[PDB]
Amino acid sequence: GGPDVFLFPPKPKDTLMISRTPEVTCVVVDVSHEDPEVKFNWYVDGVEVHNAKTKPREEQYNSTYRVVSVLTVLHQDWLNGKEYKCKVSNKALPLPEEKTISKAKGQPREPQVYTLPPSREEMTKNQVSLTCLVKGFYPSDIAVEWESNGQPENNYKTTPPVLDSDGSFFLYSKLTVDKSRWQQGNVFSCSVMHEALHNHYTQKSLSLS
Amino acid sequence: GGPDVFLFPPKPKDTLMISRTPEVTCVVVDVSHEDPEVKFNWYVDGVEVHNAKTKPREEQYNSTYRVVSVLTVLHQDWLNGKEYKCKVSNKALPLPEEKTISKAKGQPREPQVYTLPPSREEMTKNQVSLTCLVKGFYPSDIAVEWESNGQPENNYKTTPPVLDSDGSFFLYSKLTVDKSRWQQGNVFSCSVMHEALHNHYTQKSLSLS
Ligand SMILES: *[C@@H]1O[C@H](CO[C@H]2O[C@@H](C)[C@@H](O)[C@@H](O)[C@@H]2O)[C@@H](O[C@@H]2O[C@H](CO)[C@@H](O[C@@H]3O[C@H](CO[C@H]4O[C@H](CO)[C@@H](O)[C@H](O)[C@@H]4O[C@@H]4O[C@H](CO)[C@@H](O[C@@H]5O[C@H](CO)[C@H](O)[C@H](O)[C@H]5O)[C@H](O)[C@H]4NC(C)=O)[C@@H](O)[C@H](O[C@H]4O[C@H](CO)[C@@H](O)[C@H](O)[C@@H]4O[C@@H]4O[C@H](CO)[C@@H](O)[C@H](O)[C@H]4NC(C)=O)[C@@H]3O)[C@H](O)[C@H]2NC(C)=O)[C@H](O)[C@H]1NC(C)=O
Ligand SMILES: *[C@@H]1O[C@H](CO[C@H]2O[C@@H](C)[C@@H](O)[C@@H](O)[C@@H]2O)[C@@H](O[C@@H]2O[C@H](CO)[C@@H](O[C@@H]3O[C@H](CO[C@H]4O[C@H](CO)[C@@H](O)[C@H](O)[C@@H]4O[C@@H]4O[C@H](CO)[C@@H](O[C@@H]5O[C@H](CO)[C@H](O)[C@H](O)[C@H]5O)[C@H](O)[C@H]4NC(C)=O)[C@@H](O)[C@H](O[C@H]4O[C@H](CO)[C@@H](O)[C@H](O)[C@@H]4O[C@@H]4O[C@H](CO)[C@@H](O)[C@H](O)[C@H]4NC(C)=O)[C@@H]3O)[C@H](O)[C@H]2NC(C)=O)[C@H](O)[C@H]1NC(C)=O
Ligand SMILES: [Zn+2]
Ligand SMILES: [Zn+2]
Ligand SMILES: [Zn+2]
Ligand SMILES: [Zn+2]
Ligand SMILES: [Zn+2]
Ligand SMILES: [Zn+2]
Ligand SMILES: [Zn+2]
Ligand SMILES: [Zn+2]
């Protein structure tokens, strides 16, 4: 003992696509083997909200409870900086334990997206790297994926975002393809999601030149 | 109470340059306000070693001691996977608390190093990105820097290493330069240090073409 509260954000990309339902999740742990009532109260910017889905408590293998409250936030609200208080009242807590969360703050910056060919040097090999530079973005929440005519591409990795000398973020995502696919003339396209982009999406294509 | 031991590695690049003196550092904390004797014993692969520099204990502002033992390791030994035991004997510890450390294990893989020009698209701007791809390396310990004819370059950032789909590591380092420097014909050079490279160094240059 005693109770600890953790409040978790939605996934970046559930926030970046209107077609998705982003949730903030409120988790309470160390609720006593003994005193098991827990109340949740939830607020958006101060106004109390009554829509959260609270689950029946689950007993952990360490003789302690754990209770969860999911609130669904609106695409517009989250992106618009609204603040989300989860307030947790136990009879084991002398003051309700509270926690607030919102999207990452700071002026939004729209990423520049660049696609880069394989070096003269890589062209020896039986596989090549296609490179997606994404720079000057802010905040760091981002999703990056590759696709080729319709279906997406397996063999890609993306770096975490890195903080740049101007307070902004950059990132590279590397697509690896069979050299035969690149020389054929197959179009490849790096798609980026970020809040600051129009409709939070853009896409840059790269082809054999 | 009671005592906790942390054993820290050298810096990657002190390990990658023969001209440098790499140290493993053994730190003991939570040594009691009361029982202040601490003994260190140190081993390389089992054989006890007698060369470590031990500092006089420093009292922390939380009413507790902290004592440090630095051992200097040899360039050859560290790279060669030797193991470094720091053994800590307090009278508050019913068994000596021990800790071992070595270089990251696994078969070494030599990085491929590629330099990449600015996209057709970036060339509009008054600053451009020069890109250094480093891929297929193992282990992840690496140092990457840019220089231009002699002195090094300020405005660069490098991503952390990322784990690739083949168990190896890649990384990109981005140099930003004034577009006037790039068009002049100024040579730029990405230098990489990694254990698997000949003499643990290589360097790839990039120029206006
Ligand atoms: C008794 O047992 C309890 C647990 O039961 C089991 O736990 C098992 C793992 C194992 O141990 C079993 O044997 C055991 O039976 C145990 O409870 C645990 O207590 C810990 C605290 O003591 C908690 O640790 C915290 O973890 C946080 C990270 O939590 C995520 O990651 C962990 C590790 O991987 C993971 O296990 C958790 O489940 C959790 O995962 C995330 O959960 C959320 C919500 O479900 C998801 O979010 C949603 O995802 C869904 C997916 O459908 C959907 O997409 C939604 O949209 C989205 O919202 C995540 O996706 C999900 N991810 C994963 C990977 O599953 C840490 O953040 C936290 O660190 C913070 O606090 C620490 C102090 O304790 C400290 O180290 C650190 O400083 C840090 O600080 C805070 O956080 C801020 C960071 O932003 C800081 O700014 C601040 O400093 C500070 N915040 C403030 C303001 O205070 C911490 O380590 C652990 O969660 C909890 N376990 C569970 C399962 O809840 C308990 O402790 C045991 N008791 C005893 C007596 O010891
Ligand atoms: C009383 O006060 C004590 C400290 O005094 C002051 O501390 C101040 C910061 C502040 O609090 C003051 O108010 C206070 O007065 C306090 O002591 C602290 O105890 C903590 C444990 O309870 C320790 O935390 C650990 O930290 C580790 C990281 O340590 C580095 O980073 C921290 C955070 O930045 C930094 O402060 C430390 O100084 C340390 O820095 C590094 O130090 C070494 C050696 O000096 C350097 O290495 C050398 O660099 C030199 C430079 O000249 C040269 O280049 C050499 O070649 C090179 O060797 C580093 O460069 C240097 N870096 C920096 C940034 O300075 C964490 O690793 C560790 O995490 C691990 O354990 C945790 C459990 O406690 C856990 O969270 C986690 O699971 C993790 O697990 C371990 O580690 C492995 C990771 O590889 C895992 O695999 C394993 O799970 C596990 N290992 C095993 C096998 O067990 C942990 O958090 C803290 O170091 C210590 N503070 C100091 C100053 O020593 C004390 O706790 C207080 N007591 C009470 C009653 O509370
Ligand atoms: Zn607030
Ligand atoms: Zn736009
Ligand atoms: Zn529109
Ligand atoms: Zn929107
Ligand atoms: Zn060992
Ligand atoms: Zn070689
Ligand atoms: Zn040689
Ligand atoms: Zn060497």
DSSP per residue, A13-55: HHHH-TTS--EEEEEEEEEESS----EEEEEETTEEE---EEP
Residues with Cβ within 8 Å of B108's Cβ and at least 6 positions away in sequence, in order, are B138, B139, B195, B196
Residues with Cβ within 8 Å of A17's Cβ and at least 6 positions away in sequence, in order, are A193, A200
Give the C-alpha separation, B163 to A203, whole Å.
Answer: 25
Enumerate the H helices of B17-141 as residue ranges. Answer: 75-79
Q: How distant, in Å, are the alpha carbons of A139, B143, B144 from that of B157? A: 18, 11, 9
Amino acid found at B40: F
Give the C-alpha separation, A3 to A57, whole Å.
Answer: 14
Ligand 2 atom closest to Cα of B1? Answer: 109
In degrees rounded to 5, what are phi and psi of residue A193? -110, 135
Residues with Cβ within 8 Å of A62's Cβ and at least 6 positions away in sequence, in order, are none
Residues with Cβ within 8 Å of B126's Cβ and at least 6 positions away in sequence, in order, are B178, B179
Q: Which two tokens stand for residue A151?
A: 């279906």
Amino acid found at A140: S
Residues with Cβ within 8 Å of B197's Cβ and at least 6 positions away in sequence, in order, are B110, B111
Bridge partners of residue B132, in order along the sequence: B115, B173
Bridge partners of residue A72, in order along the sequence: A23
- In b/e form, how buried is each residue of A52-90, taking b as 16+ CB within 10 angstroms? beeeeeeeeeeeebbbbbebebebebbbeebebbbbbbb
Ligand 2 atom closest to Cα of B99? Answer: 93
Q: How distant, in Å, are the alpha carbons of A98, A126, B187 from that of B167? A: 43, 18, 34
The dihedral through the CA atoms of B142, B148, B151, B153 has a sign that is negative
Place of tokens 């330099």: B115
Enumerate the H helices of chain B as residue ranges. Answer: 12-16, 75-79, 179-184
Quick one: which ligand is closest to A105's CA? Answer: 3
Q: How distant, in Å, are the alpha carbons of A4, A88, B58 from that of A32? A: 11, 14, 40
Ligand 1 atom closest to Cα of A66? Answer: 103
Inter-chain residue contact B162 with A165, CB threshold 8 Å = no
Give the C-alpha separation, B7 to B101, whole Å.
Answer: 7
Inter-chain residue contact B160 with A162, CB threshold 8 Å = yes
Inter-chain residue contact B165 with A158, CB threshold 8 Å = no
Query: 3-state class of B55 per DSSP?
Result: coil
Experimental technique behind these coordinates: X-ray
Burial class (CB in 10 A: 0-12, 13-18, 19+), A95: exposed
Inter-chain residue contact A119 with B114, CB threshold 8 Å = yes
Q: How distant, in Å, are the alpha carbons of A6, B107, B208 from that of B192? A: 41, 19, 21
Quick one: which ligand is closest to A19's CA? Answer: 6
Q: Smallest Cα–Cα separation from B192: which of B139, B138, B132, B136?
A: B132
Inter-chain residue contact B174 with A133, CB threshold 8 Å = yes
Q: Smallest Cα–Cα separation from A56: which of A66, A46, A47, A64?
A: A66
Q: How distant, in Å, are the alpha carbons of A3, A97, A121, B79 from that of A6? A: 10, 10, 49, 42
Provide the 10 A C-beta neighbour count for residue B101: 17
CA dihedral A17, A19, A20, A22 (to 10 degrees): 70
Q: How distant, in Å, are the alpha carbons of B39, B55, B87, B95 from that of B91? A: 9, 19, 13, 9
Cβ–Cβ under 8 Å, residues A154 and A27? no
How many Cα atoms within 13 Å fall on the side-chain side of residue A131? 27
Detail the DSSP E strand segments found in chain B: 4-8, 23-32, 39-44, 47-49, 53-54, 64-72, 84-89, 97-101, 112-116, 127-137, 143-147, 156-158, 162-163, 169-178, 188-193, 201-206
- Chain discontinuities in chain A, listed by preceding residue (C to N exceeding 2.5 Å): none
How far does B125 lie from chain A, in Å, by closest CA? 11
Q: Which two tokens stand for residue A63?
A: 């003789």
Ligand 1 atom closest to Cα of A62? Answer: 1
Amino acid found at A160: P
Mutate which of A6, A31, A38 for ligand 1 pocket (most atoms within 8 A of beta carbon): A6
Cis ω for the linkage preceding B2 (within 30 of 0): yes
Q: In what order do the strands lie in the sheet with A39-44?
A: A47-49, A39-44, A84-89, A97-101
Cβ–Cβ under 8 Å, residues B207 and B187? yes
Domains of chain B: 3-102 (2.60.40.10), 103-208 (2.60.40.10)
Amino acid found at B176: T
Inter-chain residue contact B114 with A133, CB threshold 8 Å = no
Q: What is the resolution of this structure in A?
A: 2.5
Cis ω for the linkage preceding A2 (within 30 of 0): yes
Pocket of ligand 1 (CB under 6 A): A 4, 6, 8-11, 23, 25, 27, 29-30, 60-62, 64, 66
Q: Which two tokens stand for residue B105?
A: 């294990």
Cis ω for the linkage preceding B139 (within 30 of 0): yes
Q: Which residues of B touch A118 (CB under 8 A)?
A: 114
Interchain contact B131–A (C-beta under 8 A): yes
Give the C-alpha separation, B85 to B200, whole Å.
Answer: 26
The residue of B114, B115, B132, B207 whose CB has the most chain A CBs within 10 angstroms, and thus the best one to mutate to test that interface, is: B114
Interchain contact B59–A (C-beta under 8 A): no
- Chain discontinuities in chain B, listed by preceding residue (C to N exceeding 2.5 Å): none
Give the C-alpha separation, B15 to A193, whole Å.
Answer: 40
Q: How many residues are listed for chain A in this entry?
A: 209
Q: Which two tokens stand for residue A85?
A: 């208080």
Give the C-alpha separation, A171 to B174, whole Å.
Answer: 10
Interchain contact A140–B (C-beta under 8 A): no
Greatest C-alpha distance within chain A: 70
